[PDB]
Amino acid sequence: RIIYYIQAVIPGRAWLIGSNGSTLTVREGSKIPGYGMVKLIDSLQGRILTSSGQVIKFSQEDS
Amino acid sequence: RIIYYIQAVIPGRAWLIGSNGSTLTVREGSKIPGYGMVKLIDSLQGRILTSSGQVIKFSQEDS
Amino acid sequence: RIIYYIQAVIPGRAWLIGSNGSTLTVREGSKIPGYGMVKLIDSLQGRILTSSGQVIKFSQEDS
Amino acid sequence: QQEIQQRTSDMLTAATQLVQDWKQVETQVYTEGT
Amino acid sequence: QQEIQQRTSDMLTAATQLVQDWKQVETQVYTEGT
Amino acid sequence: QQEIQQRTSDMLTAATQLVQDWKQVETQVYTEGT
Amino acid sequence: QQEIQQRTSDMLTAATQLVQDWKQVETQVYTEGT
Amino acid sequence: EVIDKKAFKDMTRNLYPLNPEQVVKLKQIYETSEYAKAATPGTPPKPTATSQFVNLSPGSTPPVIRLSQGFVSSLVFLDSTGAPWPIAAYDLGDPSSFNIQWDKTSNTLMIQATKLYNYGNLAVRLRGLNTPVMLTLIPGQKAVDYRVDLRVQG
Amino acid sequence: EVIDKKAFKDMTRNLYPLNPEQVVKLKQIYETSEYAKAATPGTPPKPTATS
Amino acid sequence: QFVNLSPGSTPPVIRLSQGFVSSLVFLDSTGAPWPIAAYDLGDPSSFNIQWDKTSNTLMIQATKLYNYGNLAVRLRGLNTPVMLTLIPGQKAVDYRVDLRVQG
């Protein structure tokens, strides 16, 4: 599937980029495509948890 | 295989160049090709410790 | 064998020039062919100790 | 309870400090060149 | 106990000396040529 | 035990001597030619 | 025994005299010709 | 002459009250203190470069550029063929957050992040484009974009 | 000589009351305060183009 | 070292010594000089530089102790500036680096 990476992270809002190269941005209250709903976003440790239980973080190659 | 020579040892970062001339930088939380995962980046004594248990050092010629 | 002599003596490193015209610098932890490993460095009096019980100093002419 | 009032004094100075940190906003700059 | 408050005083003076050593920002400089 | 601290003050003069005796640095002297 | 420090006094004055004598070094001169 | 010997002893101990070993000790103390000063807590960001294809769609989202304080990033702006499109003018908000040197007839921008973490916006009018391109620049992350190339649609 | 060693230790302590690790952790406190100062409450908006 | 223009390629780093002059003459893939049109450098308090406006040679002086900075150089025939990171405080000092461009 399309794998998102954290292209930007602040408290409140988050910006993500698909593995194809697409663009998206979300907050904690939003519906995330392919992952359900946004559970928790933390600027500390760079992790986003979804209602599908899946976690999106930085590129390990680009951190 | 890759024989990595230290270019810049600093807290939080590492710079390496292999035996084939490819140059790169790496962090503490990251993998390493040919040595597994990065266990410790040491600012002291110019030491890089791998999860597989190896030390990366300067050339003896290039102190 | 190759005769080394001192062109400069400092704390930290040492400066050696061979009899053929080949020169280099050395540190405490290193090796030299024909003398072995540098066991200790004496910044005073321009004396360099090695593992083979041999001391490299200045030339008799460079005195 | 003098510790109460000195604590309020220093944090009120800090609060006024952040007021003068936050009540100003600088403007734009439009730059044109041929 | 009774002698540590002057120890506090020398700590902050070095600290307040250090605290403005990060606030400054060096200007980038650009040089032309022909 | 009461003469170390006056002796310590003389060291402090030498202590504050060396910081400004070391951290200063003069720049390059570039030379042109024709 | 008050003689301990009076011989120290004239000791250091010539000593402080002597140290700066080795400190200064004038630069060399240069002369062309035509 | 023991009086003069003790005189030489005390004049030595007041003329040079500081030991050479103590001199080297305080020199290492100086070096350790300034290394702790110049040290940055946390890890420094990863230096990298990117080449992005800008989508100018009205329904789309504007591009987002990571930054970090105290470093200059070069952003170049070329067409979809990659040919170097020059830059006509710009309008920048928050001058105290982002230092900027602009060569007036070039195609590349040098941007230095003056402030630490507060983010900014920037609009740029190009040469033949009726519509300007607006981008968001956000400092303070674990990735510093050293050079960003921008392939525009047009 | 214990007088000399005590004098050198006291001079070092009075010269630098702050240890280097204390300097690093107070720098951490400072930059955490800078992150707090740069922190903006509420939900930040979303930029968009409209026609 | 030979530099590379790919975005994923890591930028080159240069070890520096404080107050000691580093000479950098910039050459192409063929080794011929590529003269410098302009340059940009942050933190003049940490990096000191003489640069003549004709040659491809940079005289670099590390002013501070451990402040690392970035340098961009636009050549007389290059659109893309070359950007490198210089850091002082290593156990070696590059007196002179021969850097090679793709173009």
Side-chain angles (χ1 to χ4, degrees):
Chain A
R1 66 157 306 172
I2 299 297
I3 302 304
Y4 300 153
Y5 270 149
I6 306 304
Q7 67 195 343
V9 40
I10 61 172
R13 286 261 297 181
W15 293 260
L16 291 89
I17 164 179
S19 61
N20 66 322
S22 53
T23 157
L24 61 136
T25 169
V26 271
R27 13 212 150 191
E28 190 177 8
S30 185
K31 284 298 181 181
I32 166 167
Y35 299 92
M37 212 279 295
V38 183
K39 273 188 179 167
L40 179 55
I41 307 178
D42 192 10
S43 58
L44 174 60
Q45 299 133 3
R47 298 179 65 254
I48 292 185
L49 328 166
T50 71
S51 71
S52 54
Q54 310 177 249
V55 187
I56 305 180
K57 53 159 297 302
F58 273 68
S59 161
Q60 188 48 239
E61 201 65 35
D62 192 10
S63 65
Chain B
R1 58 144 306 172
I2 358 175
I3 305 304
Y4 283 120
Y5 277 150
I6 309 182
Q7 290 279 353
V9 36
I10 25 181
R13 312 298 306 189
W15 262 267
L16 278 319
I17 163 177
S19 48
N20 58 90
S22 57
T23 60
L24 85 157
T25 176
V26 272
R27 282 121 254 97
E28 176 54 60
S30 178
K31 69 182 176 185
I32 164 166
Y35 289 115
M37 208 273 310
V38 176
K39 166 69 190 178
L40 169 65
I41 294 182
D42 193 8
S43 70
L44 202 54
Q45 309 128 353
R47 314 196 67 252
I48 296 296
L49 297 186
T50 69
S51 69
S52 51
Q54 295 86 8
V55 197
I56 304 183
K57 205 46 76 169
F58 277 164
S59 169
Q60 228 300 308
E61 161 199 333
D62 195 7
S63 73
Chain C
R1 48 163 316 279
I2 164 73
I3 302 305
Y4 288 100
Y5 268 142
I6 296 190
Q7 69 275 21
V9 38
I10 55 164
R13 275 102 102 272
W15 308 89
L16 311 181
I17 172 178
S19 42
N20 48 10
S22 309
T23 184
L24 78 155
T25 165
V26 86
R27 68 168 200 252
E28 164 59 45
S30 178
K31 318 294 178 175
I32 163 163
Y35 298 95
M37 7 295 161
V38 181
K39 281 183 172 157
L40 211 55
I41 288 181
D42 184 19
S43 63
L44 187 71
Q45 295 162 2
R47 331 187 87 263
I48 292 300
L49 312 158
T50 351
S51 60
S52 53
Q54 300 183 104
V55 192
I56 283 300
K57 293 193 294 180
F58 284 78
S59 157
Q60 219 291 323
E61 289 306 307
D62 270 337
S63 48
Chain D
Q1 301 280 340
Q2 86 299 323
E3 22 81 32
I4 314 275
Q5 58 224 26
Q6 56 84 22
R7 181 93 277 196
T8 60
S9 73
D10 56 64
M11 78 198 316
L12 265 182
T13 56
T16 51
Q17 164 201 10
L18 260 304
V19 160
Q20 48 91 1
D21 289 326
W22 270 321
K23 291 337 115 178
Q24 81 300 328
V25 165
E26 56 193 19
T27 84
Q28 58 136 128
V29 264
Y30 159 74
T31 311
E32 184 267 352
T34 293
Chain E
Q1 307 92 54
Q2 69 279 352
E3 346 88 352
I4 59 178
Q5 61 279 12
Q6 45 89 12
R7 179 53 176 178
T8 286
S9 60
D10 51 73
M11 290 289 194
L12 49 96
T13 47
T16 47
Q17 226 303 311
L18 257 295
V19 81
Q20 28 81 17
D21 305 351
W22 341 87
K23 299 302 203 173
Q24 77 291 334
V25 35
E26 319 307 311
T27 313
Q28 52 163 8
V29 279
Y30 172 70
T31 316
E32 270 288 333
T34 171
Chain F
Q1 297 91 350
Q2 43 268 322
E3 284 76 22
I4 40 172
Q5 67 286 358
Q6 41 107 66
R7 190 234 201 220
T8 315
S9 56
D10 330 327
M11 318 313 174
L12 288 158
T13 61
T16 191
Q17 180 60 260
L18 261 311
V19 35
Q20 42 92 8
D21 279 3
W22 277 329
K23 301 305 172 177
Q24 84 299 336
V25 37
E26 48 202 26
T27 79
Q28 56 170 136
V29 268
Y30 173 72
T31 320
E32 268 294 327
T34 177
Chain G
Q1 195 62 221
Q2 80 291 336
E3 298 88 354
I4 311 297
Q5 85 296 325
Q6 46 88 14
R7 51 193 203 246
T8 310
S9 57
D10 38 13
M11 240 62 167
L12 51 95
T13 50
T16 48
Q17 163 62 41
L18 250 300
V19 47
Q20 41 88 16
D21 306 340
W22 301 300
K23 283 305 188 184
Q24 84 299 275
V25 170
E26 64 168 2
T27 164
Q28 86 149 341
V29 84
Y30 192 35
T31 306
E32 340 283 348
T34 294
Chain H
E1 329 299 321
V2 283
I3 263 76
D4 287 335
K5 236 60 67 256
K6 292 191 304 305
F8 194 82
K9 170 67 191 56
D10 55 58
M11 72 88 67
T12 316
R13 85 133 296 273
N14 55 67
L15 180 58
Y16 288 95
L18 195 58
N19 308 351
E21 49 272 19
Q22 293 168 345
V23 162
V24 182
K25 280 291 188 179
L26 73 98
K27 194 157 200 169
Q28 275 117 189
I29 285 158
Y30 280 178
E31 293 158 341
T32 324
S33 60
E34 62 98 354
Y35 221 154
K37 163 206 171 187
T40 70
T43 170
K46 176 199 170 182
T48 170
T50 34
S51 176
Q52 199 270 334
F53 168 70
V54 196
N55 184 19
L56 327 171
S57 302
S60 56
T61 77
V64 168
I65 297 178
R66 274 177 179 164
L67 281 180
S68 165
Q69 189 266 355
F71 285 92
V72 185
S73 306
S74 65
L75 320 183
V76 88
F77 293 90
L78 332 171
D79 38 61
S80 296
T81 65
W85 201 335
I87 297 171
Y90 65 95
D91 187 17
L92 173 63
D94 208 318
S96 309
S97 175
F98 299 111
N99 199 339
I100 162 170
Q101 258 90 300
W102 173 50
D103 15 25
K104 332 287 292 185
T105 60
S106 85
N107 59 332
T108 329
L109 242 307
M110 299 294 176
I111 307 301
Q112 185 189 55
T114 316
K115 275 169 186 166
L116 314 182
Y117 322 116
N118 305 115
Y119 75 108
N121 75 115
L122 161 70
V124 168
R125 295 184 56 183
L126 290 191
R127 314 305 310 269
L129 232 179
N130 196 270
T131 305
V133 186
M134 214 174 297
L135 293 95
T136 68
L137 305 106
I138 294 94
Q141 220 47 67
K142 295 176 183 174
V144 33
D145 325 354
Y146 255 72
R147 167 170 173 83
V148 183
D149 302 14
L150 284 319
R151 295 308 190 277
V152 317
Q153 293 180 338
Chain I
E1 330 298 320
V2 281
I3 272 86
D4 323 341
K5 252 64 80 199
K6 283 177 181 180
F8 184 47
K9 256 92 83 173
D10 291 329
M11 177 263 278
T12 305
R13 170 247 167 199
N14 296 315
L15 164 68
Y16 290 134
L18 272 313
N19 294 94
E21 59 277 11
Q22 302 169 334
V23 169
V24 170
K25 67 169 151 62
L26 71 89
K27 184 178 177 177
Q28 165 258 339
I29 290 175
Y30 152 76
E31 65 199 41
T32 314
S33 66
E34 295 312 308
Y35 272 111
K37 182 174 176 293
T40 62
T43 145
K46 174 161 174 168
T48 164
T50 47
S51 169
Chain J
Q1 195 271 344
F2 167 76
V3 312
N4 191 259
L5 267 61
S6 300
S9 59
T10 65
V13 289
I14 296 102
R15 45 189 177 257
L16 245 175
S17 171
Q18 179 174 32
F20 288 87
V21 185
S22 307
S23 59
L24 234 297
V25 36
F26 275 133
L27 311 177
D28 52 9
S29 288
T30 66
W34 201 335
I36 298 170
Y39 88 101
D40 190 76
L41 168 73
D43 206 321
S45 67
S46 173
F47 288 150
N48 168 243
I49 162 174
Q50 191 271 328
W51 160 66
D52 77 306
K53 266 69 57 242
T54 59
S55 80
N56 58 327
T57 324
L58 293 169
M59 314 312 183
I60 309 300
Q61 290 78 14
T63 324
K64 224 54 183 56
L65 265 301
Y66 302 113
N67 301 344
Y68 45 89
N70 71 97
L71 166 65
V73 166
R74 296 177 54 167
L75 302 172
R76 251 86 160 199
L78 227 187
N79 167 75
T80 284
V82 181
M83 303 124 326
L84 309 101
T85 305
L86 288 95
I87 160 76
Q90 213 78 205
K91 284 190 175 183
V93 37
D94 300 330
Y95 261 28
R96 174 186 45 83
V97 195
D98 336 320
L99 289 170
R100 302 190 144 276
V101 204
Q102 299 185 176

